[PDB]
Structures are given as structure tokens and as C-alpha cells.
User: Which sequence fits this backbone?
């Protein structure tokens, strides 16, 4: 993580064996990392959504509820204090799409000793390897459904689009054609999933692939088309939200 | 009372960030500072700090941030020429002040020019919330050179880098572009300015500018999609590896309650990076032994 | 930063047939652990643990 | 009235900072350009924050005298308890007599 | 430009509709014809009641499956109307039975059991006093109940109709009441649904249109007991018969 | 290093803030010693003069 | 005033509202003032007329007295206060139309 | 609130003395240079004190 420890030990020892002193001190060396892909940057959409991006993760910074606050304030304050206002949608954090994943019930035989799982993203940016994008707590009584926003950039996905896999420990589904694949089709001008089933032909980011296999691990993967992100109570302005 | 409270809430929530800075040479640990401006047409600016050292690769805590704090200095920057930096391990704010000034008057010098007297104003936050009045530096000639005598036509940006190795500040004034070339010599886009911890201003030579050529990747650039603009946060800068310049250990009582070691310190710890070999030089490593229980 | 698993393996075995787990290490003061394991790890690793 | 005056006094920071930001534009021009007021915005901000402090003292003595009113109410309640206490004192003394 | 409806609890306190909204509502006026386009009309269905014994027991009964292997959706079921305690050691989660008619299944549900020593069995008899008159008997494969389907296999629909008084133990001593439930009357439900069973009817003056999910679907969700998100195609409706008063 | 800590200590003692006063006076003196870098301080007083 | 329930020539006294002063110190040109509503909230627009000219040549005798028309957009905040107006210069367009 | 207002009022001496030191620069210039405010710094200091 661009840091390395070293240690200095002063050893003074008498001839008889009486240790005068063994003093240890730890020093840290920080390596300079000025890679543009590793340097965070600031962006703002035409809808007014301001976010920061470090590598693959995108984080909202500002908020755009002022107009709705004015609208409910023109009406009575009871209208301000409503559930519908607290679940008001927000603009997406830059260009991207929303994927809903439904994971099956926990199984000691299938999932293993540990119920929790780690969701990882694969071929993104210039990194072919895996990056842990989410951590989830499974339920032993029912299926678990969660929606994740996957960002996008111009040519951000190399060969075979972008991969999304999951690991439940004692097992990891990241083999060939096991993780969910996504790309950005220009003919439909939208984000398209690749491996929803077993297919003998399919158009992907780099052309026609004749062997598409259904994803494993995830019970159901869907693209939430036209889905707006709900109001967030854990963002940078979560303190103000909780206050109000 | 509720109406006044929600007015204040809207005013503090409509802030939009414009500048950022990082207290590290990498993006793994360190603390980040954000500075933003209100939506309304007046220059009231607020600052926030957030810690990403324990940030969990896409997951963060609400308490990890801080509330916006107003800067009570009445800064009047040119457009979006504002940036926070940290030196003397303390926060400072830099901006340019743009005023319509010209030269003297000749016989019939018809076009009394409207050039801008660009002034860097360095003001820092004192301990108890107060602010010191800014040091004033005139960099008009360098801004003219980098804007090619047309500063209003193109967006100009300023990057502040705090060299903590010997506590200096590198201010790079450049013209906004899609891509940037190397520093020093031919590239007239970037003008360098060195300011110390006391107020002494110095023009960076071409070799001095080339000494920090790796910092060109942290500029505010124009994205590939037409006229889109994407900003970037400046970083704490070191040559290649950051280590403290001094080390102090203290004292330790040895065995048998008979001896003690004290005054353990290395006042100078330097690092030379030749190619890929890193030679760390500890100057005058000294301590003291004493027969005492 | 520092690998807690590798540090625990370095301290291992805890003279009992298992690994010296974090829970079993409530345990003692900084000087105490430095005295006990001064021949196994460093000051920064002790601080991290 | 005190609270409204305090908030309405707070309602002037934006106006004077607008003065400060607009004073940067030169007023004399032509064969002699200039006349800008050098950094008027910071004295304007100083003045408005001083008057914000003034409204702060206004709210301060307002709430202080409000709490004084509450202390007066509590003292009145206690001494009314004393009054009806002596009322029943002598109520029992009367039947004794 | 947008419309938001909210949520509505359906009939029988078993189902709910939520997240009803049309984020984009545009209008194009070509000459005198007014085409209203509703983009991404979406909502969500969920098997969930208003909050009662019916909900908190039968919903988990439908969710939990048995020998057939997950699924069991789209089937007809016989349920109890109201369930109450009748007697025994303590009012635990207690044996709650439901009947799947398609596969002749008895699905049991229980919150927690007090004793893990007795081989207490799902026992259904309408008398609660004669163990010799029992009609349903299903033992626990593990000593702890896991609320498993017991797969009758035969046609005992009328048996489930006329059997009440679910009993926990009914062990070799005859009865030994552990937990007994009065199921009162019984009701018929069916978890199945059709593609045309979901529709949106627009009315505007004399123009009435019915757009279903069989011909105007943008995303067809899965087939399960959990939340089902339904989103339709952008609906372009010509509304020129509106009486503008 | 000396006058201000007792200024705060005297104010806290006058205002019955006993534990805050003790914590503040620990900056100048502590009968139980001082804990620096997780080790027993060899010095007796936390004021150099 | 609300005319939604106004009865085709008949109105109620309570249907109106009392006059409220605008504490902004607007200095419009003659009668160039108008209220509008956007973000479903009230805003006020006006032009500010000032006597300005161009630079000075050798012997440009008639230093002109053209007017720098500036639209100043200021809106009423929730608690009676006013924001300072956005300033826009539309001098060329006013010259063209006049 | 009283104490914060007092200190925050103290927070203006530097601003107005900056006004005073910056008023020395002439504002009109060219064929007619000058317009400096004669010794504005001392009245600014008087006001802030």
C-alpha cells in the first residue's frame, strides 16, 4: 500500500551478559504514487451531481434536495416531514447503470462455514485482476436482494466487458463465464448484460462470442432499467440529514 | 424558528466543492481537504476535512467527514482560482486577485490597456478560528506569459504543492488543456513559483521546474468528451520516498536496575534515490549511557 | 500496512498446540509484550496489533 | 421584537459582502481608468460579522432576561406555596382555638 | 413531469403493491393529436400482509420449502383464517400447518421449541383429545424442527379442510400437550399469476386503453415469493378525446 | 509550561471539577508517574525546569 | 391573490394578502420591474441603468452616454430575507431593440 | 454566545489594518496618477481598537 516499515535496534551489551539496552524503533517509508489512474478526480454531471472518483469507486459529495425542500416548505411543515420526502430519488453518480442481485439462502454445504460474502469487480480500467467492490451479510432465512450502481467511462471496459463475481469462502465463482458480464451497447445506446443464460452466440464489447455461459453463485441478476437511486442517509451529508 | 433553521440548512447544503488537496504522496493513507463555494453569487467559501486512511475500499463512515466551516477572510478570487494547501503541517489558502490596471500614459497612448494585476494572497487559519491577513505576491508577468496576453479567453488554473522535505511551496500557474507536456524549458504553459515558510518569493528556473516533472498528472484538465472539465487534487510531494527528517526515541532503563540509555536521536535522516537504489543516510546517530538505576 | 495473520503466525505456536489468537491476547501492557516478544517482532507491529 | 431584530440584523451580511464584491469594478474610466476600492470586501465582512456579534449580544440578554422571568415565576410559585401553607397552618389553629 | 402513487395493501392481508411511480411523463402535440408518453412505468409486488399471525406465519411458510426443492411457486394452497392458542405447556412458535394442493404437501412452521428430547410430531386431528383418532402424523427427521414439508402424497384436501387443532407432541403417552392451535375456518389461495393478470388501464374521455405485461413489458422479473419488480415499456397513448372544461 | 496549567487547575478546583482538575494537573505532575510511548517515564516531574 | 375559487366577478376580502415590502433596495430603470416564479418560487427581475461609455481615442469629443443595462435577479428566501441578485449584462441587446 | 461574539469581534483588527495598508496604493493613474487615501491605516486601527 505504498508504505514499508523498517526497524532500528540499538543493542548495547556488557561482557558479562548484562544487557545495557535493546531499544527498538520503527520507521515508515512512503513510496510516491502519482499514477493518474490512482489519483482521485472531481466530476459533476449536467444534473448537478458532484462526486469524487478514486480508481473504480465513486462517492457523492453534494446534494440536490433544495428545490424539494422549498416545495415542501411552501406547504406546511408536515409535508416536509413525510416518508415520501425522505425516500426522494437522487441523480446517478455519473454515467453508469444499476444492477440488482438476488443471492440464495445461506447453505453450510454450498456457501460453507461463513455466511458473509465478498462481491468483487474484475476487468475495469486497466486492471484485469479482482478488486473487492462490496461486502455483504447473507441471511439464513430468505434470499438477499441488493442493488449496486456500476459506473462507466469511455472505453473503461477492456476485453469481455466488465466482470462482477462473488466469493462466499470455501468457494469462489470467478472462473470462465461464471461472473456476470456487462458492456455498453451503442446500437441500443444502453448497458447490456452478456451471460444471462447459455448461448451459442452473443454480441459483447469485443464482438461475437460463440460460447456464453450463465453466471453462477448469484441466484438472479437483473438490470434495473430506469431505476433512480433512493435518498441516502449515509453519505457525506448524512450528519445534516440526521440533524434535519 | 424552524423557517430560519431550514433557511440556514439550505444555505449550508447548497455548497459546491471547487478544490481539494491530499496530505500524502499516495492515495492509500492520509487526509483529504475539500474547499467549496456557495451556490449564490457571492464569494463565501467553506472547508471540510475527511480521513480516508481507514476508508474500506468504497465504504466510508458518516462520522469520517466534518461539517462545513466558513472562511472569514472575504476572499475575492478570479473565477475559480482558489486552492487549499498544507505547509508547516498547517492549512493555508491561496488565490489570485484580479484587478483592472494599466501602465503610465504617453503622448497619445489611445488604448490604455486593461491588463490584470494578478496577486497571490496567502492567508492561513490560526489556531483559534481566526485568519491572518494574506501575504501579497505579484505574479502578473508570469500570468501574462502563460496566458499569452489573453487571460480572459482561456481558463487558468493554479496547483499548490507543499514540499515537506524542506518546507517549501511550489505554485504552478498553467493554462487549462486536454493534456500537459513536461515541465521546464520549452513549455511556456506552466510557470513555477517557490514560496518559503516566511514570505520569500522566488522564480523557479527551468531546471527547478523539471525537478518536479512528475506532478503534471495532477492538473485540472479537459476531458476527451469535447469541452468537459475534470479537476484533480494536489498532493503532498516528496522526491520519491517520504521519511521523517529526524527521529527521537527517548530513554530506556536497562537490566538489573543499574544502567540507563538516554538521548536517543538521529537529527538528520536523508534519502538519496539513484535509479532504483535507495540509500538512506542517518547523520550523527548518538545516545548516552549512564550508570543509574 | 502490516499483516495481522503473518504476525500471529510469527508469534505462533503459543506453546499449546494452537495459534496465538487475538482474543487470547487481551492481554498485557505494551512494555510487557515488548519484553516477552522482543525477539519476535518490532515496535510498529506491536502498535498495529 | 428582540428576536426579530436580531435575525433582521443578521439579514445584512449578504448585502454588505455584495458591496465589497462590487467595489472591485473601477468607477473612473476613459483616458484615466481605475478608482476601484482596494479590498473593501474584507472590511465589509468585518463590519457585518461585528454586527452579527451585536445581534448575538441581543439574543444573549434576551434569553438571560427570559430566564430571569422564569426565576421570578419559580420564586412566585414557592412563595405562593408558603402562603397557602400558612393558610392551612392557621386553619388548624382555628379549630384548636 | 413525474407521478408518484405510493403503496397499497391488497386483499386478504397477504399481498402489497409498492414503489408505484412514473418518473417521466412527456407530451408531444402534433397538429391536434396529443401523444402522452409515460417512460418506465414501474412498481413492485410483495407477499406481505398488514402485520398479523397470517402474515408472520404463512409468509414464512410459503418462503420455506421442502422435499420438492425450493420453488413451489404458482401452486394452490389451503390456509387457516385465524389461529389462536388452545392449551399446552407454553405458547411457543408452535406447529402451524399449511396445505399445498398441487403436490399434496403439508408445510409446518415453528418459531422455537422448548425441549429437544421428545420426538414431538406434526399431528392433525379435529378432536384434540383422542390420539387414536389422529389423521395426520409426521415425525421430525432431526430432533430439532426445521419447518420442513412432509409430503403427504395422497389426496387429503378434505382431510385438511376438516382437520383443526394442530398439536405438537402427541407422543407414545397419547397426547402430552406441548402446543395446540385452534385454526378456526379455512381459506383457499393460489400463488400463481398470469402474464395478462397484470395490466394498466388508462382512461381519458372516451379513450380507454389496457396495456398488459404480455405485449408492453420492458423487463420480466423472476418467479419467486420475494419482491417482484415490474417495469413496462414506454407507453405512448393518444389522448385527444379529453373534455377540457 | 507552568502558570497556565495551574490556572486551569485552580479554576476547576474552585468550581468543583475534581477529575478534570486532576487530569489537567497531570500535565505538570503525577504521583503515579507518566506514560509516554507506552512506557514508564524515567523523569519524576513533567516540567523540565 | 388566489382566483381559483373566484366566483366570476365576486371575490372575498380574505382572498388577498397584505402588502409586503421588498428589502433589497432595487434601483430599476423607470418601470422596468417584474416578478416571475421558477423553481416554483418567487424571483424578481429588473434592469439597472447607469451612465457609461467606451474608452477614449485621440480626440473623441462625444464621450457617449449609453446605458449599461443589467438584469439583476434576486429572489425571496424562505425567512423573509433576500439573496443578492445575479448580474447579467444585456446592453447590446437593449441597444439593438431600442 | 457572548464570549464567542467578543472574540469574533476581536477577529477584525487584522482585516481593517489590511485595509489601511492597502489604501496607500493609488487608485487613479495614467495621465493623472494618485488618489491614495492619506493615512487611512491609523483611523482603521482606531476603529478596530
Assistant:
Amino acid at each position: 500500500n505504498n508504505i514499508a516499515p523498517l526497524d532500528i535496534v540499538f543493542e548495547t551489551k556488557a561482557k558479562d551478559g548484562r544487557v545495557l539496552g535493546k531499544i527498538k524503533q520503527t520507521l515508515s517509508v512512503k513510496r510516491v504514487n502519482y499514477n493518474p489512474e490512482d489519483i482521485l478526480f472531481l466530476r459533476e454531471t449536467h444534473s448537478g451531481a458532484q462526486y469524487m472518483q478514486l480508481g473504480v469507486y465513486r462517492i457523492r459529495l453534494n446534494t440536490l434536495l433544495a428545490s424539494q425542500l422549498v416545495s415542501r416548505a411552501n406547504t406546511g411543515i408536515d409535508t416536509i416531514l413525510t416518508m415520501e420526502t425522505q425516500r426522494l430519488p437522487e441523480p446517478p453518480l455519473g454515467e453508469g447503470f444499476f444492477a440488482n442481485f438476488v443471492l440464495p439462502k445461506y447453505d453450510p454445504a454450498e456457501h460453507g462455514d461463513e455466511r458473509w460474502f465478498k462481491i468483487h469487480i474484475g476487468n475495469v480500467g486497466g486492471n484485469t485482476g479482482r478488486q473487492p467492490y462490496y461486502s455483504g451479510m447473507l441471511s439464513d432465512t430468505s434470499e438477499t436482494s441488493m442493488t449496486l450502481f456500476v459506473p462507466y467511462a469511455e472505453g473503461y471496459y477492456m476485453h469481455e466487458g466488465v466482470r462482477l463475481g462473488v466469493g462466499y469462502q470455501k468457494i469462489t465463482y470467478d472462473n470462465t463465464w461464471e461472473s456476470a458480464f456487462f458492456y455498453f451497447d451503442e446500437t441500443k445506446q444502453q448497458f447490456v448484460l452478456i451471460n444471462d443464460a447459455d448461448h451459442d452466440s452473443g454480441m459483447t464489447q469485443q464482438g461475437i462470442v460463440k460460447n456464453i455461459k450463465k453466471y453462477k453463485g448469484f441466484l438472479n441478476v437483473s438490470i434495473a432499467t430506469g431505476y433512480s437511486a433512493p435518498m441516502d442517509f449515509n453519505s457525506a451529508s448524512a450528519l445534516y440529514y440526521w440533524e434535519l | 424558528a424552524f423557517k430560519t433553521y431550514l433557511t440556514r440548512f439550505e444555505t449550508v447544503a447548497d455548497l459546491k466543492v471547487v478544490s481539494a488537496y491530499h496530505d500524502n504522496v499516495n492515495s492509500n493513507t492520509g487526509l483529504t481537504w475539500f474547499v467549496g463555494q456557495t451556490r449564490e453569487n457571492l464569494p463565501e467559501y467553506y472547508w471540510r476535512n475527511v480521513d480516508i486512511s481507514r476508508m474500506q475500499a468504497g465504504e466510508l463512515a458518516a462520522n469520517a467527514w466534518k461539517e462545513w466551516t466558513k472562511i472569514d477572510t472575504a476572499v475575492n478570487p478570479y473565477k475559480d482560482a482558489i486552492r487549499p494547501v498544507i505547509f508547516r503541517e498547517r492549512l493555508h489558502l491561496i488565490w489570485v486577485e484580479k484587478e483592472e490596471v494599466a501602465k503610465n500614459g504617453t503622448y497619445w497612448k489611445t488604448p490604455v490597456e486593461t491588463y490584470d494585476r494578478f496577486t497571490l494572497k496567502l492567508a492561513f487559519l490560526r489556531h483559534d478560528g481566526s485568519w491572518s491577513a494574506p501575504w501579497s505576491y505579484d505574479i502578473t508577468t508570469q500570468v501574462e506569459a502563460v496566458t499569452d496576453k489573453k487571460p480572459d479567453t482561456e481558463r487558468l488554473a493554479l496547483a499548490a504543492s507543499g514540499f515537506q522535505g524542506e518546507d517549501t511551496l511550489l505554485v504552478f500557474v498553467y493554462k487549462t488543456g486536454k493534456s500537459y507536456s513536461d515541465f521546464g524549458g520549452s513549455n511556456k504553459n506552466v510557470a513555477g513559483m517557490t514560496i518559503y515558510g516566511d514570505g520569500s518569493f522566488k522564480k523557479m528556473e527551468n531546471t527547478a521546474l523539471s525537478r518536479y516533472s512528475q506532478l503534471k498528472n495532477t492538473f485540472d484538465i479537459i476531458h476527451t468528451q469535447g469541452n468537459d472539465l475534470v479537476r484533480k487534487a494536489s498532493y503532498r510531494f516528496a522526491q520519491d520516498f517520504e521519511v521523517p527528517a529526524s527521529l527521537n526515541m527517548g530513554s530506556a532503563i536497562g537490566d538489573d536496575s543499574l544502567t540507563v540509555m538516554e538521548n536517543g536521536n538521529i537529527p538528520q535522516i536523508t534519502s538519496k534515490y539513484s535509479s532504483d537504489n535507495l540509500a538512506i543516510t542517518l547523520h550523527n546517530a548518538a545516545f548516552t549511557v549512564r550508570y543509574d538505576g | 500496512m502490516y499483516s495481522t495473520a503473518v504476525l500471529l503466525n510469527k508469534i505462533s505456536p503459543t506453546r499449546d498446540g494452537q495459534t496465538m489468537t487475538l482474543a487470547d491476547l487481551q492481554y498485557l501492557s505494551f512494555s510487557e509484550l515488548r519484553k516477552i516478544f522482543d525477539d519476535q517482532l518490532s515496535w510498529g507491529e506491536a502498535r498495529h496489533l | 421584537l428582540l428576536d426579530a431584530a436580531a435575525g433582521q440584523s443578521l439579514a445584512g451580511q449578504v448585502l454588505s459582502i455584495a458591496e465589497g464584491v462590487a467595489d472591485l469594478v473601477p468607477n473612473v474610466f476613459g483616458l484615466a481608468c481605475g478608482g476601484s476600492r482596494w479590498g473593501a470586501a474584507l472590511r465589509a465582512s468585518a463590519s457585518v460579522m461585528s454586527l452579527s456579534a451585536t445581534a448575538s449580544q441581543y439574543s444573549a440578554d434576551k434569553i438571560s432576561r427570559s430566564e430571569a422571568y422564569r426565576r421570578r415565576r419559580q420564586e412566585w410559585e414557592i412563595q405562593r406555596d408558603n402562603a397557602d401553607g400558612e393558610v392551612k397552618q392557621m386553619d388548624a389553629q382555628l379549630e384548636s382555638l | 413531469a413525474s407521478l408518484n402513487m405510493g403503496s397499497a395493501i391488497g386483499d386478504d392481508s397477504l399481498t402489497v403493491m409498492e414503489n408505484g411511480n412514473i418518473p417521466q411523463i412527456t407530451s408531444k402535440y402534433s397538429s391536434d393529436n396529443l401523444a402522452i408518453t409515460l417512460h418506465n412505468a414501474a412498481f413492485t409486488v410483495r407477499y406481505d400482509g398488514s402485520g398479523n399471525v397470517i402474515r408472520n406465519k404463512q409468509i414464512s411458510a410459503m418462503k420455506l420449502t421442502g422435499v420438492d426443492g425450493k420453488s413451489q411457486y404458482g401452486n394452490a394452497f389451503i390456509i387457516a383464517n385465524t389461529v389462536k392458542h388452545y392449551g399446552g405447556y407454553s405458547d411457543l412458535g408452535g406447529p402451524i400447518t399449511v396445505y399445498n394442493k398441487t403436490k399434496n404437501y403439508i408445510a409446518s412452521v415453528q418459531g422455537h421449541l422448548m425441549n429437544a428430547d421428545y420426538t414431538r410430531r406434526l399431528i392433525l386431528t379435529p378432536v384434540e383429545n383422542n390420539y387414536y383418532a389422529r389423521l395426520f402424523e409426521f415425525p421430525f427427521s432431526p430432533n430439532t424442527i426445521l419447518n420442513t414439508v412432509f409430503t403427504v402424497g395422497s389426496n387429503k384436501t378434505s382431510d385438511f379442510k376438516k382437520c383443526s387443532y394442530a398439536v405438537d407432541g402427541n407422543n407414545s403417552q397419547g397426547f402430552q400437550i406441548f402446543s395446540s392451535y385452534q385454526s378456526s375456518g379455512w381459506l383457499d389461495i393460489d400463488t400463481g399469476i398470469n402474464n395478462t393478470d397484470i395490466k394498466i388501464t388508462v382512461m381519458a374521455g372516451s379513450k380507454t386503453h389496457t396495456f398488459t405485461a404480455s405485449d408492453h413489458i420492458a423487463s420480466l422479473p423472476a418467479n419467486s415469493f420475494d419482491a417482484m419488480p415490474y417495469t413496462f415499456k414506454p407507453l405512448e397513448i393518444d389522448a385527444s378525446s379529453l373534455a377540457f372544461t | 509550561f507552568y502558570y497556565t496549567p495551574m490556572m486551569c487547575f485552580q479554576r476547576l478546583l474552585q468550581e468543583k471539577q475534581f477529575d478534570e482538575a486532576t487530569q489537567w494537573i497531570n500535565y505538570v505532575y503525577n504521583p503515579a508517574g507518566y506514560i509516554v510511548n507506552g512506557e514508564i517515564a524515567p523523569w519524576i516531574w513533567n516540567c523540565r525546569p
Summary: Chain F touches chain B through five residues (CB under 8 Å). Helices of chain F lie at 3-14, 18-25. The CA atoms of residues 34 and 40 of chain F lie 6 Å apart.
